């Protein structure tokens, strides 16, 4: 039961990292586009 | 026992990714601030 609970919590932690990476990809793409345009 | 050991190792791998994302968020924020200031 502690193992299932750990996997559940780790999945939430994984989702947070996936969402964070998506945010950062969009932010650096916005910067690269700005610099290209300038 | 292999499952507990795998969850332990995966938690270390998750911590490394969380730390890495924090580093990158700070780096792109520093760049966005530089560009705003310029």
């Amino acid at each position: 039961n502690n193992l299932l609970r750990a996997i559940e919590a780790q999945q939430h932690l994984l989702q947070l990292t996936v969402w964070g990476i998506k945010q950062l990809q969009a932010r650096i793409l916005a910067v690269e586009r700005y610099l290209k345009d300038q | 026992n292999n499952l507990l050991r795998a969850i332990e190792a995966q938690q270390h791998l998750l911590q490394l990714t969380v730390w890495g994302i924090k580093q990158l968020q700070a780096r792109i924020l520093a760049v966005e601030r530089y560009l705003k200031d310029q």
Binding site: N2, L3, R5, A6, A9, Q10, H12, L13, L16, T17, W19, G20, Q23, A26, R27 | L4, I7, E8, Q11, L14, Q15, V18, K22, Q25, L29
Partner: peptide, 29 residues
Amino acid sequence: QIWNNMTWMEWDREXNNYTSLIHSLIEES
């Protein structure tokens, strides 16, 4: 859908909270 600074500080809190729980679960085992 662009997270601001406060949303990133909530992200950090939520990551700390899940990490603390997982540490306890793996120890308690």
